[PDB]
Write a protein that binds this ligand. Structure first.
Ligand code: ACO
Ligand code: OAA
Ligand code: OAA
Lengths: 1021, 92
């Protein structure tokens, strides 16, 4: 896609990046004035505006300004100011377009004679680049193809300056020959290294001082940005000069760029009654052409798309925008909405119609008020359910909605809505049944579709032999062969895939637009690969021309780029062409037919399969050559291939506007090379070079002898008529219909539309990973951070599933910090240190001590909480608990230090006791426990409440008396084991810190002293 | 029900090739447990079947058993046995 740029941007790029021995004058001498900006700042930032004479021109992509006189030449400052007074900022027109005039380019005027001027133009064609030059200056340059000098330079070819001198400068004046040679060489290099498509400099003032550029136009390959974004800087593409964009049109435009979907909307008549909301660019072209041809040319409101599987929000917004625009002004003859569409490849029709029905139900008021009628036609996955829900809402909201499926032709509904009809060495055999393909990329969906097509076509071997993915190791992917499981090898290099599968002759390159070129070259370096199908869309045209050249030299057939692929029923299917097996079975694409079709875009291919299946025997072969304007295989290269094929009996061709291609078919049939019946119809009339239009092409085909219909509506009718023309003579014999093998429904597909149940295990309630944001209990992660709850808060949410009050969260944090570490001598830290000094990883190392926890190391927390609980809630007063446990011969857990005591407090029990006292509401078990410690510290004085005990009791008392748990919940948590989770968590920090330490100290393997073992082995066993 | 009569497909993960619990008998490689015991292959034989998926010759099975016996223990001072003793001595 070559986009025209503002002449200022081309001027700047020429100034920065030209390279020639001669000197270019007036470098960085230009200015731009808009009605939105004043003059003083521009009059001061460029100090050369008061040095010489100036010339001003409209810099808004306006052609042939010299004949129409929209340029002010040889005028000084106030002269151009007074010239701009009646022009700068209001409605102006040129040719047919009317619109606001926004930009002016101002250039220091160069004194030039009429003989010093020159004409140059470099434009890219399919086979190379044309450079064109005339020496007789001015506008009067005469015919350029005979008197001016042309030069075709090939692709990947270097321009010799001697060739420029010998072939281009034959009639140029001798004085300026040597400077123009270098200038043209530099201009060609500048053209070639910035991927320009069109570069026309007119006129070119070459005086004795040097070279002067005054006016030029440039169209640049917008797809090559990834190569030259650093070179073009901040490139800008101006819209064609015309009327202002409506608020709703700009709304849709900005709503398109936010996603990966294709959303288009352009108004033709804002007060019209026929509105099209159709999926597929070719589909919109077809509906627009049919309505314009069927008398709705003066009433068709707009054209546009919603494609690329738009989201439900995108579809809702697009539908409400398009419906609000038809409810502004009403119409005496009613109003029509046409929700058309091509046959969907894989997108579920039901979901799109759910979005559309939601929008229609929300906008039904004005729609009923304005007396609108909705015609909906669609096909693809689960189109029946979508039509059912559309009819259900048509009966519900009262808006008359007429729903149709694949059985009806595309543009019948627009014939029904308007009331015109009543409303009810290149080879010829690319693919054989022994064909195998290598798929380049992780495209498991496409490969599975190919395998399903192979199985339903009764093939004996899969058509995918191996997959190449450079970003992973060599392994095997598990795929389906009907019911069976098969393993398709995935390789990292192309080389080993090629060697292990020497009989593979097709490569389907699923690479991106910036990786298809080199991959395709590397594939061409293997002689066994006879055809390459390039699916990527957006490869720059120069790289595509290099691909075409190398394919021609190596005899490889390229299908693409920017193609969906080609489908040969019963034999082969490239990637995703045809769609899922619902479309393949609906269009009877599992058995060969006798009609071969060649299309340009991939959106019309599915409709062509539908039409050919429902009107004739069926499709024998169908190839979409791609939407790029340098396709790897033209129409001719495939029509000759079909002519050489004895299997086919008639050929359908569907081209578009632009490109002298079907004239080659005309020359072929008048030459007599093509004899089989050819039906064709070039879509894209849109007449609302003169030979490039679809109407002229259709004519030339009609008088050439090709059965061209008057519109698309009778395309199926004319192919049917050719079908009787060929079966009456007895050359086409309809084959007997054999039922195809059936594949089971996919589980994911059968659950998406919900005809099946599977019970789900792993009930979970602490995190919801899916959706827009992480949800811990019921509050999203953003609300977790905005409410400023810390780690204690997320333990509340994840462990107890409750938004705990602030003091309990801070207490959880506190008891994590006191638990964090207690030295390396203890058993768990010992295990972590031993495993960390044995070369093991953090997980192993720390989890070793993690395991070590539980009973004797680590289990006093719970042991006390569960003891003191059963002591408080059973009535025993503090001193009958001290005495019951003596008698039971057990010790109280939670009571007992070794060195600390009355007078030497524990200092970690004092920080935490003082928070549990100052901040907690009621602490009834910390009181019972601090009374059992009066009875026990009377005995020995070091029998105080240990940190274990305190944390235990204070957590039982925050769980029970805080306000969120209900004393059964708060007693499940104590039993399930949630106090062994606090200890564990705390130790985990310390444990890791003893891994990270013994790893910084680089300590080695620990062999235990043997003097500290005392082997007690038996005598002789 | 829909899979019993086979109108649906679900991809199965967890390819396994060392044991078949389902069916009449346990099958280690392809050789049932009764054949495992009738051919008198020992623990080395079932390492051959489960680990390498092959019915190893008799000397290979006996050598695997031998190298398991020599590896069995090397005292309590070494690091791993130290960790096992520490964790066993903590009541786990
Ligand atoms: C110059 C000279 O020295 S000559 C002086 C001559 N006199 C002496 O020699 C007297 C010196 N000895 C003593 O007085 C001492 O009492 C001793 C050494 C006999 C024993 O004293 P203690 O260490 O207090 O006894 P013990 O170790 O059994 O502990 C006392 C209590 O702590 C309790 N206790 C210990 N740990 C815990 C625990 N974790 N939870 C609850 N209770 C506990 C025990 O149940 C015991 O209870 P009891 O008194 O009801 O049986
Ligand atoms: O088949 C494709 O690649 C295109 C597709 O799914 C869709 O958007 O309908
Ligand atoms: O917490 C435990 O049960 C063990 C411990 O840290 C200590 O040695 O005091």
């Amino acid at each position: 896609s070559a986009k025209a740029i503002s002449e200022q941007t081309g001027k700047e790029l020429l100034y920065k990046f030209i390279c020639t021995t001669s000197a270019i004058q007036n470098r960085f001498k230009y200015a731009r004035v808009t009605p939105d900006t004043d003059w003083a700042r521009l009059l001061q930032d460029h100090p050369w505006l008061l040095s010489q004479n100036l010339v001003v021109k409209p810099d808004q992509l306006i052609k042939r300004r010299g004949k129409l006189g929209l340029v002010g030449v040889n005028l000084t400052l106030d002269g151009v100011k007074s010239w701009l007074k009646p022009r700068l900022g209001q409605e102006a027109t040129v040719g047919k377009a009317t619109g606001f005039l926004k930009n002016f380019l101002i250039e220091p005027f160069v004194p030039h004679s009429q003989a010093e001027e020159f004409y140059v133009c470099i434009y890219a064609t399919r086979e190379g680049d044309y450079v064109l030059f005339h020496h007789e200056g001015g506008v009067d340059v005469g015919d350029v193809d005979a008197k001016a000098q042309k030069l075709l330079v090939g692709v990947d070819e270097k321009l010799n300056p001697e060739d420029i001198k010998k072939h281009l400068l034959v009639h140029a004046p001798e004085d300026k020959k040597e400077i123009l040679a270098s200038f043209i060489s530099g201009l060609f290099n500048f053209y070639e290294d910035l991927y320009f498509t069109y570069l026309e400099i007119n006129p070119l003032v070459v005086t004795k001082d040097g070279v002067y550029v005054l006016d030029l136009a440039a169209k640049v390959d917008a797809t090559a940005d990834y190569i030259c974004k650093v070179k073009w800087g901040d490139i800008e593409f101006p819209p064609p000069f015309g009327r202002e964009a409506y608020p709703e049109e700009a709304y849709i435009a900005d709503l398109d760029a936010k996603s990966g979907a294709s959303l288009k909307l352009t108004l033709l008549n804002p007060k019209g009654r026929i509105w099209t909301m159709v999926a597929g660019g070719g589909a919109s072209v077809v509906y627009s052409d049919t309505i314009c041809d069927l008398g709705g040319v003066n009433e068709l409101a707009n054209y546009g798309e919603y494609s690329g599987a738009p989201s439900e929000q995108q579809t809702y917004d697009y539908a409400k925008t398009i419906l609000s625009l038809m409810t502004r002004e009403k119409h005496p003859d009613g109003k029509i909405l046409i929700i058309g569409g091509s046959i969907a490849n894989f997108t579920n029709v039901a979901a799109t119609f759910k979005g559309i029905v939601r929008a229609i139900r929300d906008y039904q008021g004005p729609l009923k008020e304005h007396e609108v009628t909705i015609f909906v036609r669609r096909g693809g996955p689960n189109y029946q359910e979508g039509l059912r829900v559309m009819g259900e809402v048509g009966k519900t909201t009262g808006i008359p909605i007429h729903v149709f499926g694949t059985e009806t032709h595309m543009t019948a509904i627009v014939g029904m809505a308007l009331g015109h009809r009543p409303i009810p060495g290149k080879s010829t055999t690319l693919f054989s049944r022994h064909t195998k393909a290598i798929v380049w990329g992780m495209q498991t969906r496409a490969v599975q579709g190919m395998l399903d097509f192979d199985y339903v076509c009764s093939r004996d071997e899969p058509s995918v032999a191996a997959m190449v993915y450079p970003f992973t190791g060599d392994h095997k992917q598990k795929f389906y062969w009907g019911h069976k499981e098969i393993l398709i090898p995935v390789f990292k290099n192309m080389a080993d895939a090629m060697r292990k599968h020497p009989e593979v002759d097709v490569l389907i390159n699923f690479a991106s637009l910036r990786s298809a070129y080199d991959s395709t070259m590397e594939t061409m370096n293997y002689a066994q690969i006879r055809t390459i199908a390039i699916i990527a869309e957006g490869i720059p045209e120069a790289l595509t021309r290099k691909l075409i050249k190398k394919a021609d030299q190596k005899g490889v057939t390229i299908i693409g780029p920017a193609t969906v692929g080609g489908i040969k029923p019963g034999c082969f299917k490239i990637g995703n062409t045809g769609g899922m097996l619902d479309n393949i079975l609906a269009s009877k694409l599992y058995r060969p037919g006798s009609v071969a079709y060649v299309s340009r875009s991939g959106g019309m291919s599915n409709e062509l399969n539908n039409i050919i299946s429902r009107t004739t025997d069926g499709v024998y072969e169908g190839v979409a050559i791609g939407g790029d304007r340098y396709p790897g295989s033209t129409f001719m290269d495939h029509v000759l291939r079909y002519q050489d094929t004895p299997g086919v009996k008639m050929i359908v061709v569907l081209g578009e506007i632009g490109g002298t291609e079907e004239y080659k078919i005309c020359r072929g049939i008048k030459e007599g090379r093509l004899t089989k019946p050819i039906v064709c119809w070039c879509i894209g009339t849109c007449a609302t070079q003169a030979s490039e239009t679809a109407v002229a092409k259709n004519q030339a085909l009609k008088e050439a002898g090709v059965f061209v219909p008057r519109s698309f509506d009778e395309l199926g009718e004319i192919i049917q008529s050719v079908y009787e023309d060929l079966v009456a003579n007895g050359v086409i014999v309809p084959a007997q219909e054999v039922p195809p093998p059936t594949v089971p429904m996919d589980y994911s597909w059968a659950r998406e539309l919900g005809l099946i149940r599977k019970p789900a295990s792993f009930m979970t309630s602490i995190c919801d990973e899916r959706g827009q944001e992480l949800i811990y209990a019921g509050m999203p992660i953003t609300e977790v951070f905005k409410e400023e709850m810390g780690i204690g808060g997320v333990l509340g949410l994840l462990w107890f599933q409750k938004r705990l009050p602030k003091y309990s969260c801070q207490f959880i944090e506190m008891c994590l910090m006191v638990t964090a570490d207690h030295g390396p001598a203890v058993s768990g830290a010992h295990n972590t240190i031993i495993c960390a000094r044995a070369g093991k990883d953090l997980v192993s190392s720390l989890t070793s001590g993690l395991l070590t926890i539980g009973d004797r190391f680590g289990g006093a927390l719970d042991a006390a909480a569960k003891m003191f609980s059963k002591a408080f809630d059973s009535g025993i007063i503090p001193m009958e608990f001290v005495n019951k446990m003596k008698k039971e011969g057990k010790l109280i857990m939670g009571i007992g230090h070794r060195v600390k005591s009355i007078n030497n407090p524990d200092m970690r029990v004092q920080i935490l006791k003082d928070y549990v006292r100052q901040h907690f509401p009621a602490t009834p078990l910390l009181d019972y426990a601090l009374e059992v410690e009066k009875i026990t510290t009377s005995k020995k004085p070091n029998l105080i409440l240990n940190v274990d005990g305190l944390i235990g009791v204070a957590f039982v008392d925050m769980l029970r008396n805080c306000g969120s748990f209900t004393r059964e919940e708060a007693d499940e948590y104590i039993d399930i084991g949630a106090l062994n989770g606090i200890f564990v968590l705390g130790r985990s920090m310390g444990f890791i810190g003893h891994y990270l330490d013994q790893k910084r100290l680089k300590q080695g393997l620990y062999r235990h002293p043997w003097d500290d073992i005392s082997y007690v082995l038996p005598e002789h066993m």
